[PDB]
């Protein structure tokens, strides 16, 4: 049904989402990016420390309410 999530970025950018536990987390992901002006890739979202699948959903994460998600700027070695 509905569980309010807390997507915390890596620059004090906090955003709250109400999502249906039947919806693919990608929808959440996407929203963030456009409501923030950043390509779907540019970032990366995590939960319980481990990364988040694009098809994921609390249906798999059992994320209760008040949960938290971390977003990290995407990067690579050099």
């Amino acid at each position: 049904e509905y569980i309010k999530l807390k997507v915390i970025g890596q620059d004090s950018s906090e955003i709250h989402f109400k999502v249906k536990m039947t919806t693919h987390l990608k929808k959440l992901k996407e929203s963030y990016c456009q409501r923030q002006g950043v390509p779907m890739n540019s970032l990366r979202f995590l939960f319980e420390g481990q990364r988040i699948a694009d098809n994921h959903t609390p249906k798999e994460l059992g994320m209760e309410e008040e949960d938290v998600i971390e977003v990290y700027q995407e990067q690579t070695g050099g």
Binding site: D11, Y72, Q75, G77, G78
Partner: protein, 156 residues
Amino acid sequence: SGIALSRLAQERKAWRKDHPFGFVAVPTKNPDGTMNLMNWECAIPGKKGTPWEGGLFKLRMLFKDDYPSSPPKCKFEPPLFHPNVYPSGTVCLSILEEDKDWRPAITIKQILLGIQELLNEPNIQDPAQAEAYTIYCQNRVEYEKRVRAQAKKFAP
């Protein structure tokens, strides 16, 4: 540059009030007794879980007059054993490169945080030091074994 000394000034205050746990980012000082902002002395913790855990790795951070336009140069003191860290100890990382992933909106908290993530996500598909790239490919069990070591050697 533009507003380097200010933004930097701010990032120090902001850093003091709030900052990631286990990380250290103290600037240095001028002869004047004042505070040096164009040069900090940071120290990134390992990462619980990863084989890099346990140690605390120091790294300097030199900023140019231009900042935040151009990113800050970063060097591990002393140099680390890692596929993407030059022999000089410079950390080569997409995020830190002006003409690539660097964007002014990035802060020191991010860099240090990034660099930390980088410790365990080497880009062997493009090394910066023969030493490590070799061992990494040559044998993995050893590369970790070498790491576990380097980490202990730098444990607080």
